[PDB]
Design a protein around this ligand. Structure first.
Ligand SMILES: O=C(O)CCCCP(=O)([O-])Oc1ccc([N+](=O)[O-])cc1
Lengths: 217, 214
């Protein structure tokens, strides 16, 4: 297989600098040209620049000429995007892309803020709450009180993806986010199958695995 | 910079419909244009390059064409999986430029939501807070009303809801509503209910639970 793995999401203070990475697996320098793209809601994709790992040559979108610096290391097969003098306008998702734009990284969410990071508390949303439903049952996890976004939620370490809905986070009056991830499953196998949600909030290095099962009463 | 003007910004289309998106280059780009697709999860993939050449593995329903400075992407039979934002990319000169993007929305039949209600977990209760969650699963259209009722009394000021984007499989939406109360306030009442109103229902559907000792 082949893909581009980008560094984790993070929060950085205004005025500071940060360096994002994009490591390639499968291919390497041979393809040449590693591009960096910026994206914000209601704003399309914006090209920052690109680098030729073979000779270190770089080309930038004029607007980023004094804001972004792209570097590459063929040995470790990694490209870096250094952003300086961070401002609220730098809060976005950054994507790295290979030659011809065939391979794209999963993106890195950068939040510029003067606030502290906050790890979430993960609570189970047990199936068959009081009693069983008409054939199908729902279950999930409540990821509450975290900052900033985003949070990654998997089920059974990737083994469960069918019928999953991870809702957009809501901003609570405290300035902290909260979201839920739910799954609909057969009610008949609640006693035989195991469902565990895998939560990860990179900005605070919080990683939680919560087994969601029907509670006794 | 070569400006890529993409239209329309948003497009709503029924399943099986033949749709097209267009990008007009402000400069001669000689066919050096790619079409990229970004799904709800942030995943970006290239569908076409050289204006009309389909990438390996790209479904035949996708096709690109050129007529002067007008570059179009056409989808023969719109499928639920096609729900995404499409961007044209100019790679003829520097700096590389993207079109504004076209948000493709999917029209489908009215579907009634399956409602579920969840009590606060015991471990959360230990922390002094209680979040009651109401789930409206797989419905269409997006419009829906959810009302919280504690002991039959309508609630206001203590809830937050969030709706997903259209599902990649069936084009439906799902809504989650959370009623957050303090442990003390939670323990003060018995019946917690969620009343849902949606076009796919002849009458409001109410789901509830009674906080009994376990
Ligand atoms: O001869 C030259 O300078 C052009 C050859 C480079 C083709 P390319 O790699 O820039 O194609 C791409 C253009 C843009 C992107 N992008 O992610 O914005 C990705 C690939």
């Amino acid at each position: 297989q082949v893909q581009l793995q980008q560094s984790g999401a993070e929060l950085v203070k205004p005025g500071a600098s940060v360096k994002l990475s994009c490591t390639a697996s499968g291919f390497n320098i041979k393809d040449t040209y590693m591009h960096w793209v910026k994206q914000r809601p209601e704003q399309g994709l914006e090209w920052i620049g690109r680098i030729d790992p073979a000779n270190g040559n770089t080309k930038y979108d004029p607007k980023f000429q004094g804001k972004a610096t792209i570097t590459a290391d063929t040995s470790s097969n990694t490209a870096y995007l250094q952003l300086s003098s961070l401002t609220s306008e730098d809060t976005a998702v950054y994507y790295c892309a290979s030659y011809y734009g065939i391979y794209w990284g999963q993106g890195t969410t950068l939040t510029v803020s003067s606030a502290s990071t906050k790890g979430p508390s993960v609570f189970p949303l047990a199936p068959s709450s009081k009693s069983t439903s008409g054939g199908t049952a729902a279950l999930g996890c409540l990821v509450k009180d975290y900052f900033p976004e985003p949070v990654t939620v998997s089920w059974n370490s990737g083994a469960l993806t069918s019928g999953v809905h991870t809702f957009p986070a809501v901003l609570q009056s405290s300035g902290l986010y909260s979201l839920s991830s739910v799954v609909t499953v057969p009610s008949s196998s609640l006693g035989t199958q195991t469902y565990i949600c895998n939560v990860n909030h990179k900005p605070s290095n919080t990683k939680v695995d919560k087994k969601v099962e029907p509670k006794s009463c | 910079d070569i400006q890529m003007t993409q239209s329309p910004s948003s497009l709503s289309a029924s399943l099986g419909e033949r749709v097209s998106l267009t990008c007009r280059a402000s400069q001669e780009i000689s066919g050096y244009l790619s079409w990229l697709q970004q799904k709800p999860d942030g995943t970006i993939k290239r569908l076409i390059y050289a204006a009309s050449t389909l990438d390996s593995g790209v479904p035949k329903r996708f096709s690109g064409s050129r007529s002067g400075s007008d570059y179009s992407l056409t989808i023969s039979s719109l499928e639920s999986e096609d729900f995404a934002d499409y961007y044209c990319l100019q790679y003829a000169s520097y700096p590389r430029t993207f079109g504004g993007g076209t948000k493709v929305e999917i029209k489908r039949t009215v579907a009634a939501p399956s409602v579920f209600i969840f009590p606060p977990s015991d471990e959360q209760l230990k922390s002094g807070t209680a979040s009651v969650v109401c789930l409206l699963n797989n419905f269409y259209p997006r419009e829906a009303k959810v009302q919280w009722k504690v002991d039959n009394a309508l609630q206001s000021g203590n809830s937050q809801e969030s709706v997903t984007e259209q599902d990649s499989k069936d084009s439906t939406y799902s809504l989650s509503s959370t009623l957050t109360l303090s442990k003390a306030d939670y323990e003060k009442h018995k019946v917690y209910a969620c009343e849902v109103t949606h076009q796919g229902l002849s009458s409001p559907v109410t789901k509830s639970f009674n906080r009994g000792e376990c």
